[PDB]
Amino acid sequence: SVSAFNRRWAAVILEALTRHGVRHICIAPGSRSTLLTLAAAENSAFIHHTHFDERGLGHLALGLAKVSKQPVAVIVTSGTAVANLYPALIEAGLTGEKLILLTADRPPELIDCGANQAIRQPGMFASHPTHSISLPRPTQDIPARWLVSTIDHALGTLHAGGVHINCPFAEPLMDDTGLSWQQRLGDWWQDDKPWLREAPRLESEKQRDWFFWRQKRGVVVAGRMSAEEGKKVALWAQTLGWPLIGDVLSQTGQPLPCADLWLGNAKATSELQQAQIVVQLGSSLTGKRLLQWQASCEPEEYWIVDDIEGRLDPAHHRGRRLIANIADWLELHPAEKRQPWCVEIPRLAEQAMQAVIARRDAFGEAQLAHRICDYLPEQGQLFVGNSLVVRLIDALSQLPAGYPVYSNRGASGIDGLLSTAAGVQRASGKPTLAIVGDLSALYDLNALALLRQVSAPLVLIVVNNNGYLMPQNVHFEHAAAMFELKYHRPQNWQELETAFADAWRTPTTTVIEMVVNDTDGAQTLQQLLAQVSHL
Amino acid sequence: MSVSAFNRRWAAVILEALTRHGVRHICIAPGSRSTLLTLAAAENSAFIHHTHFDERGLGHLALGLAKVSKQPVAVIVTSGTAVANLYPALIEAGLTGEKLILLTADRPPELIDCGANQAIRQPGMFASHPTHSISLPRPTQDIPARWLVSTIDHALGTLHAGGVHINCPFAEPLEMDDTGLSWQQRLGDWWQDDKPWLREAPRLESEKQRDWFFWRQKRGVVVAGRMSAEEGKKVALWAQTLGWPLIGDVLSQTGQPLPCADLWLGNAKATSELQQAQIVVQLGSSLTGKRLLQWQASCEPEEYWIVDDIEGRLDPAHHRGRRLIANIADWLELHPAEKRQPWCVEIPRLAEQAMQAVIARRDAFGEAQLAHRICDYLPEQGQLFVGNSLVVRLIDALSQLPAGYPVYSNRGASGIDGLLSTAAGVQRASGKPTLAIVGDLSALYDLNALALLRQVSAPLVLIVVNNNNVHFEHAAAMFELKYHRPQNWQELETAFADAWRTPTTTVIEMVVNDTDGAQTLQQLLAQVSHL
């Protein structure tokens, strides 16, 4: 019986994932995946998640992996369902999320010969996966200990990113056929561990000349890192005396706020030319000015510390790329009290924040961005789309140390922000504020279906500047209502404060739509930038 | 010096090259780094522009335009995941043959793998799915213009079917001084010409089968699947001329003279006449019916032939036989029929009885009924866009669609992921009034393409067969589309009366059970298996 064996074959694949940390599982309905689905429904170790848009399912997985820092499975049916995993897959491969995708395949008898829901799947994602397994047609003449060891190889040696696992099943898909095959794994069925542990660690080693470099004029730059990390970096820089430029994604507390303004002042840039070393911890910097400054700074040595692989410095400084847990790194390269060498930067920053304050009253996109610690859920988290309002938050707010932030800023796609925030919220269980533009809200409209189901209040701010028949000036009321969500389109700050009060009250998602122009935002920034640069 | 003014002319040329090969429609999205191709295509007045914000949707919209018009259609997108969202349309094309030309804009290669923003590895991304893949180098006036136009010409010229992926890096930035300009004039008077630079256009076709005059006297069965509307008729003639039975699929537009095949294929008196069949000729591919699929899996004719304009094996049962690549119209001309007496005695009896069996269940307000009575609602001189959904299994099993009335489908890999936005592509290409039916699931899946359906050159009705707790009333309202949810045949007729007057999309949601529709079919399968 082909369909009894094909079930043991799947159950064997699922049980192994379980031994590498996989708890969350994302499924969508489909008439061929059934095997792996069935198999995962029987396995009591998994949290189930679903969504009918497969693109959105990949993002929802990405959300979860993002916050939980654990690997996360996705199961899908054969055909175009699979291609749709491609965005989240690509993003993961750039930021580290362990997405394990199990793609059910037609068997290889049935490829390239006109069958339904049948396409060429192995290899499908080119080099985007960290690993790609392309499982063979199931047969009892390959031992279970081969199959689990292949899974084990991939998950075990996975430092970061996605793993495509194509899973063909015989056709058509109730008795004792896979049984002694499964039995040959013995008391492995009762164990915590993988069948074959292979988890080498990838890690840069200790910089032996740190004790020299830590006495020079360095500058610290903080990118995306864990919230604990922001805090750790915050002291480590303070302890050293080096200015810290910290990015919205950093969670450092931003002890020199508004760097996108103040890096424009020649008094500032000319204090930095004097820098000998630049340690940047994490990556994906947000600001135009910080990106530019970084492109142009000259230092004797450039360092980028981060647990991701590869070049991260798009201007290609002479310097080092150090692969490490940031927190571990800082313990390994510890700071020592030295009095700060920068004297103007700290004034400029203070002043540049006074200049942003002076401009808080007007009800547009910059002021919302400036006022945004006002609106964070207590014990909450922020998620941040890829849209001017996030450059604005970075330029103009000073977000709390240690307060969690998330984003899809690997490739900064705008195609999955609602689904991702869904995952992001479901993972941690926390109240969530998520900020996004109208195109992103329209791109991923039906993940509103998702944001119905959330374990704690989620507020989605949609900044809408919108942008046979006359065009097309779209809003988000009927959307919120299509999916039974609360909606508020506050006309001013009182209405915004009220709409928040309402929204923190129950565990559902509430849409708050702030309508603004295409220019006020960019402009207030340019004006502030010009003001700050003269002072 | 000016890099920008030349990256302009590099783009201008790629686009103009395309113009020489049938491309008129270009579908585009808002984008940071595809500015250059966007702009070259805007200053170029051979193109019809179409636009959409969800790149997955765009791919399907072009799949739409290309499917109907049969001419290649270009797509432009900015660098990053916008590009990945092209995968599904690209795949489908590869199976159905649409010519999607993907211009994907890309960070220049100094910027790849170094944590630059919105930068990913693009060459290679779509693996084996496109038919030609091109990785254009970093733009320089050191590579002459003739090369770039020729590289294009070769890729378009030699393309039988499916997508081409032209990845185009541009050096940053975007003086507009004259920097491109002599470089372009080395092309000389090509610029005013109407023909490619290089004409490389081999034709691909199987040769007249020299033994047809023998097999055509044999006891043949004709299966017809997706072909053109003219084709459906030439096939309906031919099959009648020979005396062979025609099993005619919802996508065949053959008139379906032996209607309800899905019902009667399940009756022994017909399985048995079909066993007597010594040759089978299947023209087109992607058969729909569950029975016709099985029947085809187990038939054991002396020979199985498939005629289609597309390469590859198409018989997923692997019969001894032949796979002939040809335009069907042409094929029929190169293998005409000789009038001959029908060998089929019992099959026409059972299909009349089939229909008449369906007809007595024509009353109840459900999906199976709505499938059955779909011709009442066909817009006159219109086109049918059918989704991938039980309800379209019902059209094919329980209805009989008029000969040569145009159907269209995404049935290469049958995803349910871009049906609305394919539907818009389909209305816009031909200008016709258009009916489209889909499931709730489909409609949610590609929900945001309601934005495209706002925009039609003629009325579009989107019937949405919803089978349960969301309803489409507010989606329709978001996009300022008319909406109905009829509760019976009088409410449904009223809905339609309106929807035909104007160049807009009217959404019509029919609510049903998860079960009626299949029960109705099971039950009708049985009653027919008993006469």
DSSP string spanning A2-29?
HHHHHHHHHHHHHHHHGGGT--EEEE--
Which tokens is A486 given? 């609360």
Express the helix, strand and coil content of chain A in percent, nearest 5 each.
Answer: 40, 15, 40
**Residue whose structure tokens are 């279906």:** A449
CB atoms within 10 A of CB B5: 16
Per-window interface: A 297-316 vs B, CB < 8 A:
310-314, 316
Give the residue before each break in chain A, using a C-to-N cut-off of over 2.5 angstroms; say none if it is continuous: 173, 467
Q: Where are the beta strands (DSSP E) in B131-188?
A: 132-135, 164-169
Phi, psi (rounded to 5 degrees) for B324: -110, 130
Picking from A118, A99, A98, the residue whose alpha carbon sits closest to that of residue A108 is A118
CA atoms within 13 A on the CB side of B395: 27
Amino acid letter, B31: G
Which tokens is B516 given? 């009626």
Phi, psi (rounded to 5 degrees) for B526: -60, -55
**Using an 8 Å Cβ cutoff, are A521 and A464 in contact?**
no
CB atoms within 10 A of CB B129: 22
Amino acid letter, B335: H
Q: Which is it for strands B25-28 and B73-77: parallel, antiparallel or unpaired?
A: parallel
Tell me whether the CATH fold assigned to A201-338 matches the one assigned to A339-535: yes
Question: How far is the C-alpha of B310 from the C-alpha of B131, rounded, in Å?
Answer: 12
Number of H helices, E strands in chain A: 23, 17
Question: How far is the C-alpha of A384 from the C-alpha of A407, rounded, in Å?
Answer: 5
Question: How far is the C-alpha of A469 from the C-alpha of B28, rounded, in Å?
Answer: 19
Counting beta carbons within 10 angstroms of the beta carbon of residue B63, is it exposed (0 to 12), middle (13 to 18) or buried (19 or more)? buried
Asked if B445 and A446 come within 8 Å (Cβ–Cβ), the reply is yes
Listed as own residue / partner, the contacts of B94-97 with beta carbons closer than 8 Å and 24 or more positions apart are: B94/A119, B94/B129, B94/B130, B94/B131, B94/B162, B94/B163, B94/B412, B95/A119, B95/B412, B95/B413, B96/B67, B96/B226, B96/B310, B96/B410, B96/B411, B96/B412, B97/B160, B97/B161, B97/B162, B97/B309, B97/B310
Question: How far is the C-alpha of A229 from the C-alpha of A492, rounded, in Å?
Answer: 36
Asked if B117 and A284 come within 8 Å (Cβ–Cβ), the reply is yes
Helices (H), B158-274: 181-185, 212-215, 229-242, 261-264, 268-274
Q: What is the largest CA-CA distance in chain A?
A: 81
Amino acid letter, A329: W
CA atoms within 13 A on the CB side of A252: 28
Question: How far is the C-alpha of A290 from the C-alpha of B68, rounded, in Å?
Answer: 50
Picking from A338, A270, A272, A331, the residue whose alpha carbon sits closest to that of residue A305 is A331
Question: How far is the C-alpha of B184 from the C-alpha of B178, rounded, in Å?
Answer: 11
Q: Which is it for strands B383-386 and B434-439: parallel, antiparallel or unpaired?
A: parallel
Q: Which is it for strands A381-384 and A319-323: parallel, antiparallel or unpaired?
A: unpaired
**Using an 8 Å Cβ cutoff, are B99 and B66 in contact?**
yes
Amino acid letter, A40: A
Question: How far is the C-alpha of A432 from the C-alpha of A489, rounded, in Å?
Answer: 19
**Using an 8 Å Cβ cutoff, are A406 and A384 in contact?**
yes
Q: Could you say which architecture CATH assigns to the domain A1-200?
A: 3-Layer(aba) Sandwich (3.40)
Picking from A163, A200, A204, A155, the residue whose alpha carbon sits closest to that of residue A308 is A204
Q: Could you say which architecture CATH assigns to the domain B203-340?
A: 3-Layer(aba) Sandwich (3.40)
Instruction: State whether residue A199 is helix, strand or coil.
Output: coil
Amino acid letter, B82: A
Phi, psi (rounded to 5 degrees) for B244: -100, 155
Question: How far is the C-alpha of B471 from the C-alpha of B452, rounded, in Å?
Answer: 19
Asked if B115 and A312 come within 8 Å (Cβ–Cβ), the reply is yes
CB atoms within 10 A of CB B194: 7
Q: What angle do CA A260, A411, B30 make, to 5 degrees?
A: 85
Express the helix, strand and coil content of chain B in percent, nearest 5 each.
Answer: 40, 15, 45
Question: How far is the C-alpha of B448 from the C-alpha of B327, rounded, in Å?
Answer: 36
Phi, psi (rounded to 5 degrees) for B106: -145, 150
Secondary structure letter of residue B76 according to DSSP: E
Q: What is the largest CA-CA distance in chain B?
A: 83
Helix (H) / strand (E) containing A322 = strand A319-323
Picking from A15, A12, A477, A532, the residue whose alpha carbon sits closest to that of residue A256 is A532
**Using an 8 Å Cβ cutoff, are B462 and B420 in contact?**
yes
Phi, psi (rounded to 5 degrees) for A512: -110, 115
A205 Cβ contact list (under 8 Å, min separation 6): none
Question: How far is the C-alpha of A200 from the C-alpha of B448, rounded, in Å?
Answer: 45
**Using an 8 Å Cβ cutoff, are A508 and A487 in contact?**
no
**Using an 8 Å Cβ cutoff, are A397 and A249 in contact?**
no
Question: How far is the C-alpha of B227 from the C-alpha of B204, rounded, in Å?
Answer: 18
Which residues on neighbouring strands pair with residue A278, listed in sequence order? Answer: A219, A302
Question: How far is the C-alpha of B143 from the C-alpha of B151, rounded, in Å?
Answer: 12
What is the radius of gyration, based on Cα positions, of chain B? 25
CB atoms within 10 A of CB A184: 11
Instruction: State whether residue B304 is helix, strand or coil.
Output: strand
Asked if A120 and B128 come within 8 Å (Cβ–Cβ), the reply is yes
- Give contacts of A284 with chain B, Cβ < 8 Å: 115, 117
Asked if B82 and A415 come within 8 Å (Cβ–Cβ), the reply is yes
Shortest distance between the Cα of B106 and any Cα of chain A, in A, equals 12
**Using an 8 Å Cβ cutoff, are A355 and A396 in contact?**
no
Question: How far is the C-alpha of B120 from the C-alpha of B138, rounded, in Å?
Answer: 16
Question: How far is the C-alpha of B425 from the C-alpha of B60, rounded, in Å?
Answer: 8
A180 Cβ contact list (under 8 Å, min separation 6): none
B440: nearest CA partner in chain A: A52
**Residue whose structure tokens are 């010009």:** A530
Asked if the C-beta of A470 comes within 8 angstroms of chain B's C-beta atoms, the answer is no
Instruction: State whether residue A245 is helix, strand or coil.
Output: strand
Distances (CA, A) of A75 to A81, A448, B218: 10, 21, 49
Per-window interface: A 372-411 vs B, CB < 8 A:
411
For the domain A339-535, what is the CATH superfamily, name and number? Thiamin diphosphate (ThDP)-binding fold, Pyr/PP domains (3.40.50.970)
Measure CA of the first residue to CA of the last residue in chain B; give whole Å: 83
Q: What crossing angle do the helices spanning B516-530 and B347-359 adopt, rounded to 10°? A: 140
Question: How far is the C-alpha of B434 from the C-alpha of B456, rounded, in Å?
Answer: 10
Question: How far is the C-alpha of B245 from the C-alpha of B220, rounded, in Å?
Answer: 8
Cα–chain-centroid distance for residue B153?
25
Per-window interface: B 433-462 vs A, CB < 8 A:
441, 444-445, 447-448, 451, 454-457
Chain A contact probe: residue of B33, B63, B117 with most A CBs at under 10 A: B117
Q: Could you say which architecture CATH assigns to the domain B341-531?
A: 3-Layer(aba) Sandwich (3.40)
Question: How far is the C-alpha of A531 from the C-alpha of A325, rounded, in Å?
Answer: 39
Phi, psi (rounded to 5 degrees) for A329: -60, -45
Asked if B81 and A94 come within 8 Å (Cβ–Cβ), the reply is no
Q: What crossing angle do the helices spanning B87-96 and B55-69 adopt, rounded to 10°? A: 20
Cα–chain-centroid distance for residue A26?
17
Asked if the C-beta of A79 comes within 8 angstroms of chain B's C-beta atoms, the answer is yes
- Does the domain spanning A201-338 belong to CATH 3.40.50.720? no
A473 Cβ contact list (under 8 Å, min separation 6): A466
Per-window interface: B 90-109 vs A, CB < 8 A:
90-92, 94-95
Picking from A507, A383, A518, the residue whose alpha carbon sits closest to that of residue A454 is A507
Q: Which is it for strands B279-283 and B25-28: parallel, antiparallel or unpaired?
A: unpaired
**Using an 8 Å Cβ cutoff, are B55 and B5 in contact?**
no
Entry resolution in angstroms?
2.7
**Using an 8 Å Cβ cutoff, are B404 and B378 in contact?**
no
Residue A172: cis peptide before it, omega within 30 degrees of 0: yes
**Residue whose structure tokens are 């080498």:** A200
Which tokens is B443 given? 């409609």
**Using an 8 Å Cβ cutoff, are B280 and B303 in contact?**
yes
Total residue length of chain B: 531
Partner residue opposite B447 with nearest CB, options A311, A412, A446: A446
Instruction: State whether residue A402 is helix, strand or coil.
Output: coil
Q: Which is it for strands B132-135 and B73-77: parallel, antiparallel or unpaired?
A: unpaired
Which tokens is B91 given? 């795949």
**Using an 8 Å Cβ cutoff, are A177 and A5 in contact?**
yes
**Using an 8 Å Cβ cutoff, are A528 and A289 in contact?**
no
Which tokens is B191 given? 């610029």
Instruction: State whether residue B169 is helix, strand or coil.
Output: strand
Picking from B244, B248, B250, the residue whose alpha carbon sits closest to that of residue B273 is B244
Asked if A118 and B478 come within 8 Å (Cβ–Cβ), the reply is no
Which tokens is A68 given? 């939980």
- Give contacts of A474 with chain B, Cβ < 8 Å: 451, 478-479
CB atoms within 10 A of CB A192: 6
Q: What angle do CA B351, B357, B363 make, to 5 degrees?
A: 135
Picking from B246, B331, B323, B328, the residue whose alpha carbon sits closest to that of residue B292 is B246
Asked if B286 and A316 come within 8 Å (Cβ–Cβ), the reply is no
Cα–chain-centroid distance for residue B461?
18
**Using an 8 Å Cβ cutoff, are B328 and B307 in contact?**
yes
Helix (H) / strand (E) containing A419 = helix A417-428
Instruction: State whether residue B353 is helix, strand or coil.
Output: helix
**Using an 8 Å Cβ cutoff, are A126 and B127 in contact?**
yes
A:B CB pairs within 8 Å: 176
CA atoms within 13 A on the CB side of B22: 14
B289: nearest CA partner in chain A: A116
Helix (H) / strand (E) containing A49 = strand A47-50
Partner residue opposite B85 with nearest CB, options A94, A311, A415: A415
Question: How far is the C-alpha of B244 from the C-alpha of A7, rounded, in Å?
Answer: 44
Question: How far is the C-alpha of B304 from the C-alpha of A481, rounded, in Å?
Answer: 54
**Residue whose structure tokens are 């930035």:** B173
Amino acid letter, A87: P
Which one of 3.40.50.970, 3.40.50.620, 1.20.1290.10, 3.40.50.720 gives the CATH number of domain B1-202?
3.40.50.970
Which tokens is A448 given? 């509103």
Helices (H), A157-249: 179-183, 210-213, 227-240
What is the radius of gyration, based on Cα positions, of chain A? 25
**Residue whose structure tokens are 């969350």:** A24
- Give contacts of B81 with chain A, Cβ < 8 Å: 86-87, 90-91, 411, 413, 415
Measure CA of the first residue to CA of the last residue in chain A; give whole Å: 81
Question: How far is the C-alpha of B251 from the C-alpha of B249, rounded, in Å?
Answer: 5
CB atoms within 10 A of CB A163: 22
Helix (H) / strand (E) containing A83 = helix A80-83
**Using an 8 Å Cβ cutoff, are A27 and A75 in contact?**
yes
Q: What angle do CA A224, A225, A227 make, to 5 degrees?
A: 120
Asked if the C-beta of B318 comes within 8 angstroms of chain A's C-beta atoms, the answer is yes
Instruction: State whether residue A200 is helix, strand or coil.
Output: coil
Domain positions in chain A are 1-200, 201-338, 339-535
